[PDB]
């Protein structure tokens, strides 16, 4: 009997806010400022060498 089960059709989509995006988030937080910050300073500059540059 369990094998005979089926699945209902779910809703197509929920509400899509016309003024919020992943790159331009509507509300503010320090998390998004952190993403923009580490994109500016770039990722950790990992050295492949065995001795320091200086």
């Amino acid at each position: 009997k369990e094998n005979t089960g089926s699945m209902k059709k779910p809703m197509a989509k929920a509400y899509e806010h016309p003024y919020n995006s992943e790159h331009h988030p509507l509300n503010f937080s320090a998390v998004k400022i952190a993403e923009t910050f580490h994109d500016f300073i770039g990722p950790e500059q990992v050295s492949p060498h065995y001795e320091s540059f200086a």
Binding site: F40, G42, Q45, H49, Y50, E51
Partner: protein, 135 residues
């Protein structure tokens, strides 16, 4: 017997198939040495051990063979200069991260800025006084 048995065994001493394509350090560490670290003597021991494995601890082969520099450090000053030009704030940020972990007081930070900007302000006045002497 077991010692020589494994030394002769090809499987025990065999480079992987891709070993040729891998990046190979062509130095034992004698080109750029750390002179003032507390493990200084420990570093030399690993250089001495690496030189011995290459010659089966018959260092006469090393004395007769060719000695080479660390060609991996070539053009390292130019490369860091271009990275500083590409993104100076990122280059400065990460090169000073471990140092900036210990932040001094507000007073000290202010003294740095105040004395630095004051020195730049006097430098500008001396540039102006030179234009007064030229006139």
């Amino acid at each position: 017997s077991l010692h020589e048995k494994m030394q002769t065994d090809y499987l025990w001493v065999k480079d992987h198939s891709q070993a040729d394509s891998w990046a190979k350090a062509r130095t034992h560490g004698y080109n750029y040495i750390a002179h003032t670290v507390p493990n200084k003597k420990e570093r030399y021991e690993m250089i001495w051990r690496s030189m011995g494995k290459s010659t089966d601890w018959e260092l006469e082969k090393f004395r007769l063979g060719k000695k080479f520099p660390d060609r991996g450090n070539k053009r390292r000053w130019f490369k860091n200069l271009f990275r500083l030009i590409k993104n100076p704030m990122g280059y400065i940020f990460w090169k000073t991260y471990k140092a900036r972990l210990a932040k001094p007081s507000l007073i000290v930070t202010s003294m740095f800025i105040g004395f630095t900007l004051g020195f730049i302000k006097l430098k500008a006045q001396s540039i102006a006084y030179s234009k007064k002497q030229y006139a």
